[PDB]
Amino acid sequence: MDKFRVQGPTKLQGEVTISGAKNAALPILFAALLAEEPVEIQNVPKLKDVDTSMKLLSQLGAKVERXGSVHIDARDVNVFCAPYDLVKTMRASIWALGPLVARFGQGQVSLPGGCTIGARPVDLHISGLEQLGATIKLEEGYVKASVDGRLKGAHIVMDKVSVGATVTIMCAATLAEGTTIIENAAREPEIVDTANFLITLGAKISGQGTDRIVIEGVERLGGGVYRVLPDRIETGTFLVAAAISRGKIICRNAQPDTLDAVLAKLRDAGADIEVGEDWISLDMHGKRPKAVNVRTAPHPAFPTDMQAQFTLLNLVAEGTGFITETVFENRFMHVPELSRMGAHAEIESNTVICHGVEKLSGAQVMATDLRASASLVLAGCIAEGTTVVDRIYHIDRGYERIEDKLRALGANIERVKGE
Ligand SMILES: CC(=O)N[C@H]1[C@@H](OP(=O)(O)OP(=O)(O)OC[C@H]2O[C@@H](n3ccc(=O)[nH]c3=O)[C@H](O)[C@@H]2O)O[C@H](CO)[C@@H](O)[C@@H]1O
Ligand SMILES: *[C@H](C)[C@H](O)P(=O)(O)O
């Protein structure tokens, strides 16, 4: 099992080109199960979850290939049970269910996996599909859905905001008979990107990006060419990397408007930020960041996917700052690991109270999920001495070539294999 050995401290500065969003590429790949003409998806990041999704789609009978772009021809899909091994390793696999039921009248998918940061039920996906007319039963761990004929449009008032369930309902509604209105819909940029991809195929959707999405079902979806938007979490991760190391960075192929909350908190931390049509620059002017208070919540509020990274920022910042996590109930595993590197923090229920220190010390650490693992690698870059982050395959799920990108910013990092 691979690890990253990092030698610190190193000031991270330079430039990085942001890859396509992990969390837009994934729902779009599964939405392609609805397409009855070939599709070309551009700017797809080379990530472990994308590899898993391509294999999963192939096992359903879709013809899939890639490089920068992924090409999919789902016209001959003929298997409606997703394979357990591919389903259980990530969260995105749940998105195979809705398209299979909407287009073929049936689908079976085991409960998903992915980030171990909460119980992560899928009750809202099930409830939404049931409201669209699907009959669903859970048996031996598989969610089995079916419908005789087409799904039927419905006015669905989500009783909890959910990125994934909004996607499931929106995608399935594109082939339903009639109009579907999703209330309390998640507004994330990836939902807007998935909607625009579906519209490219011929779907009729409006309201994406707002709390109310209206879908008018059509008989079938066609094909198209679509470019995935930039990864806002990767962008935020590199901006934090520059901030905590008192450096400067320019992120290219970025989309500033997907990061209003994050950029505002970085400015509160003392960063000098400028933005262009497709880039973001951050300069600390050699200064240590100032601690900030943060509360995660659904988009456009501060994203839970940037929470571990900002915990790190506060732990090396000037002063005390808190990080309140309201979206997931078990997303503080990075804290005890950063404490072993010399950080000072206390956890009070859903909030981490951070007291910034001047410098961290290298240590052997390990994170059990994607963003926590990336945060430990960033800590290693600025810590004094050697840090070894174990189980880094978690990072591969959401970052394309983080090693090369950090190295280009000045990091001393090596991927060590086999012990
Ligand atoms: C593959 C992907 O896109 N992953 C992202 C997606 O995950 P994901 O789609 O799983 O996020 P959700 O928004 O659905 O989850 C938010 C909250 O709702 C709860 N919930 C969710 C679904 C459901 O059926 N029932 C339920 O109770 C969750 O367990 C959590 O407490 O959005 C999260 C929140 O921005 C991100 O952190 C993930 O990186
Ligand atoms: C970590 C939360 C990842 O983004 P997911 O794919 O498991 O959601």
Q: Which helix (H) or strand (E) holds 104?
A: helix 97-104
Assess whether 263 and 335 both reside in one domain. Answer: yes
The dihedral built from the CA positions of residue 357, 360, 364 and 367, taken in this order, carries a sign that is positive
Q: Which residue has the tokens 């290693």?
A: 380
Nearest alpha-carbon partner for 220 in 258, 175, 275: 175
Is residue 25 classed as helix, strand or coil in its secondary structure? Answer: helix
333 shares its domain with 389:
yes
Residues 223 and 37 sit within 8 Å (Cβ to Cβ): yes
Smallest CA separation from ligand 2 atom 4, residue? 115
Question: Count of CB atoms within 10 A of residue 5's CB?
Answer: 16
Residues 117 and 188 in one domain: yes
| H runs (alpha helix) in 146-286 | 163-173, 189-200, 232-244, 260-268
Picking from 228, 255, 281, the residue at the C-terminal end of a domain is 228
The phi, psi pair for 294, rounded to 5°, reads -135, 145
Ligand 1 nearest-atom number relative to CA 122: 24
The rounded distance, in Å, linking the Cα atoms of 375 and 245 is: 13
Other beta carbons less than 10 A from residue 410's beta carbon = 15
- Cβ partners under 8 Å of residue 288, min gap 6: 246, 316, 317, 318, 358
SS3 of residue 279 by DSSP: strand
| 32, 155, 184, 200 from 225: Cα distances, Å | 11, 30, 30, 8
Measured in Å, residue 287 CA sits from the centre of ligand 2 at 33
Residue 50 beta carbon below 6 angstroms from any ligand 2 atom: no
Residue 371: both structure tokens together: 């963003």
Scan for tokens 């992560």, then name that residue. 120
Contact yes or no for 243/267 (Cβ under 8 A): no
Distance CA 240, CA 13 (A): 11
Q: Is 23 in the pocket of ligand 1 (CB under 6 A)?
A: yes
How does DSSP assign 66-77, residue by residue? Answer: E---EEEE-TT-
> What's the distance, CA 131 to chain centroid?
27
Please tell me if the CB atom of residue 114 comes closer than 6 angstroms to any atom of ligand 2.
yes
CA–CA gap between residue 417 and residue 144 (Å, rounded): 40
Edge-to-edge strand ranges of the sheet holding 212-216: 155-157, 179-183, 212-216, 204-206
Ligand 1 atom at minimal distance to the Cα of residue 305: 37
Does the Cβ of 91 fall within 6 Å of ligand 2?
Answer: yes
Phi-psi sector, 24: left (phi>0), alpha (psi -120 to 50), beta? alpha
Q: How many angstroms separate the CA atoms of 380 and 8, rounded?
A: 6
Please indicate the experimental technique that yielded this structure. X-ray
Note the ligand closest to the C-alpha atom of 92: 1
- Check whether residue 200 and residue 76 sit in a common domain: yes
Q: Which residues are part of a known binding site for UDP-N-acetyl-alpha-D-glucosamine?
A: 91, 120-124, 160-163, 305, 327
Are residues 332 and 399 located together in one domain of the fold? yes
CB 242 within 8 A of CB 220: no
First to last CA, the chain: 7
**Amino acid found at 209:** G
Return the ligand number nearest the Cα of 27: 1
Tell me which amino acid residue 83 is: P
- Residue where a domain stops, chosen among 209, 228, 247: 228
Sign of CA dihedral 242, 248, 252, 257: positive
Q: Please answer whether residues 247 and 285 qualify as being in contact, where contact means their C-beta atoms are separated by less than 8 angstroms.
A: no
Q: How many domains are contained in the chain? A: 2
Asked if 371 and 313 sit in the same domain, the reply is yes
Neighbouring C-alpha atoms within 13 Å toward the C-beta of 324: 7
Same domain, 311 and 335: yes
CA–CA dist 198, 96 (Å, integer): 15
Helical pair 189-200 and 163-173, crossing angle rounded to 10 deg? 10
* Rounded CA separation 419/204 (Å): 52
| DSSP track, 35-101 | BSS-EEEES----HHHHHHHHHHHHTT-EEEE---EEEE-TT----B--HHHHHT-SGGGGGHHHHH
Phi, psi of 157 (to 5 degrees): -100, 100
Question: Residue 331's domain spans which residues?
Answer: 1-18+230-419
319, two tokens: 């002063």
Boundary (domain end) residue, out of 186, 201, 228: 228
Round to whole Å and give the CA distance between 77 and 269: 50
Is 328 touching ligand 1 by the criterion CB < 6 Å?
yes
Secondary structure of 291-338 as H, E, C letters: CCCEECCCCCCCCHHHHHHHHHHHHHCECEEEEECCCCCCCCCHHHHH
Cα of 20 to ligand 2 centre, how many Å? 15
Computed from CA positions of residues 329, 23, 373, 245, in that sequence, does the dihedral angle turn out positive or negative?
negative
Q: Which atom of ligand 1 is closest in space to residue 233's alpha carbon? A: 39
Indicate if 87 and 211 belong to the same structural domain. yes
CA of 18 to the centre of ligand 1 (A): 23
Ligand nearest to the CA of 193: 1
Q: Is 370 in the pocket of ligand 2 (CB under 6 A)?
A: yes
Q: How far apart are CA 358 and CA 29, in angstroms?
A: 44
Contact 241, 261 (CB under 8 A): no
My answer on whether 247 and 192 are in the same domain is: no
Report the alpha-carbon angle 202-203-208, nearest 5. 135
Q: What is the DSSP letter of 302?
A: -
Strand ranges (DSSP E) for 351-394?
Answer: 351-355, 364-366, 385-390
Cβ atoms of 319 and 344 closer than 8 Å = no
Residues 35 and 132 in one domain: yes
Task: Kindly give, in sequence order, each residue whose CB lies less than 8 Å from that of residue 285, ignoring residues fewer than 6 positions away.
Answer: 248, 272
Tell me the CATH number at 156: 3.65.10.10
Q: What is the DSSP code (8-state) at residue 18? A: P
- CB atoms < 10 A from the CB of 253, how many? 16
Q: Which residues are catalytic?
A: 115
Same domain assignment for residues 295 and 359: yes
- The HSE-up count of residue 292 (CA atoms within 13 Å, CB side) is 26
DSSP string of 131-178? HTT-EEEEETTEEEEE-SS--B--EEE-SS--HHHHHHHHHHHTTSBS
The closest residue, in CA terms, to atom 10 on ligand 1 is: 164
Alpha carbons 48 and 60: distance in angstroms, whole number:
19
Residue 400 C-alpha to ligand 2 middle, in angstroms? 15
- Residues 261 and 282 reside in one and the same domain: yes
